[PDB]
Design a protein around this nucleic acid. Sequence first.
DNA 1: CTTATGACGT
DNA 2: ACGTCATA
Length: 429
Amino acid sequence: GPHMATGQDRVVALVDMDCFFVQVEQRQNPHLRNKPCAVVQYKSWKGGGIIAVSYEARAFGVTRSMWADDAKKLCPDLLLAQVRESRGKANLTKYREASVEVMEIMSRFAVIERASIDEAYVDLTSAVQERLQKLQGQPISADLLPSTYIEGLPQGTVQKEGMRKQGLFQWLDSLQIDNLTSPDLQLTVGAVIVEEMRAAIERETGFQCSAGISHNKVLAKLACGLNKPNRQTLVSHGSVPQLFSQMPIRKIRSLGGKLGASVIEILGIEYMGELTQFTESQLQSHFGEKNGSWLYAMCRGIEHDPVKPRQLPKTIGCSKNFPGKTALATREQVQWWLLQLAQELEERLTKDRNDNDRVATQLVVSIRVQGDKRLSSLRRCCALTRYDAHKMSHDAFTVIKNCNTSGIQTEWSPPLTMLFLCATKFSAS
DNA sequence: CTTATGACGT
DNA sequence: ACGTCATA
Ligand SMILES: Nc1nc2c(ncn2[C@H]2C[C@H](O)[C@@H](COP(=O)(O)NP(=O)(O)OP(=O)(O)O)O2)c(=O)[nH]1
Ligand SMILES: [Mg+2]
Ligand SMILES: [Mg+2]
Ligand code: NA
């Protein structure tokens, strides 16, 4: 009805880099450019574990979580770059730094929420209103949207760019005619700005990215993945019913795990759109008040989670798995690795303080023990009063030492399969 | 045979 | 404070 909210109050973008770590490595080594390429961690065991894959390499079926030795079977010519290894562990510093390059460019256009090392949300609502005033009812040319897809169009040509343009033309013709709503116009100007943002990013870093533009974070994120790489996608409120009608529930953010599986199992459905049939109370009874409320609105393309003004990460941490045989079975060994972890952390904390005028005040220590399915066996915290690796490693050991079942002080049992140090609770410096 | 992040429940 | 989930 007239009083019914449609969740069209905001313009939100999600900008996500294509094959991020690969591009960073490609920029540094031109030999890797425009080639089937992947980035791995370590190399001894099975060639190393792949965590990023160029789109050339993806065409051969290489994916994330694949051992490099196995990827080579699919793609014999696969080029590999290795994550920096420091103090016996993976060091992601280059990418965190590359991340900052991108975040800083994005932050010139609008307030951003860093969502991961390679992506951020953008609230473009104010920016759109400002650009709209500047444009005096002056129509929007397709030249202003050279990489934009309008999801759901065309409707009513053989090549992809041909279909992109026709859908875009159909969309633009419906704004200029007055067939579309003002939210639609707002989304379009938002997409214009994102084109500019993405141009600035590539010019100034050499990195390409994709983007989604919509009315909320979830639709923005979903939209971004629709036309990767090097393209942006506008998902309108109107496109939602068709989009969601065959959209598997697991594809929506936060529903890719257990909750999503329970939604599918309990309700006996498969697609996001099928959720509209249930009342809010019904959804609440099965999945709780909060989730139920979120699911009722989300299946209608409505989501209110704000873009938090947070450009920097809330936490600074590092970890290392010691699986199977490599599990840490002595006290001396556990302490040595706590020191390696603490040294990297201290290095990152020190730079963080100089860069961002803040200090962590709490240190979180997490371990995993052999034979435990759970990712984390035990979590403990202590005060973080000094940026000193020796103290931090020593304190971390103090808070976890009790775990040691072994009767001998010299040996550690059950052996440790993971160590994790996280600096948290920042305050102004 | 990974290394991170953020959010939420109790 | 601690554990769990979700992301990738
Ligand atoms: N250490 C570690 N780094 C990872 C892992 N998974 C991903 N990364 C790193 C490597 C990734 O480059 C980066 C960004 O994550 P995505 O955006 O999910 N993948 P990409 O940007 O590669 O491709 P596209 O977005 O176009 O699909 O984070 C992991 O399990 N562990
Ligand atoms: Mg990416
Ligand atoms: Mg990403
Ligand atoms: Na090359």
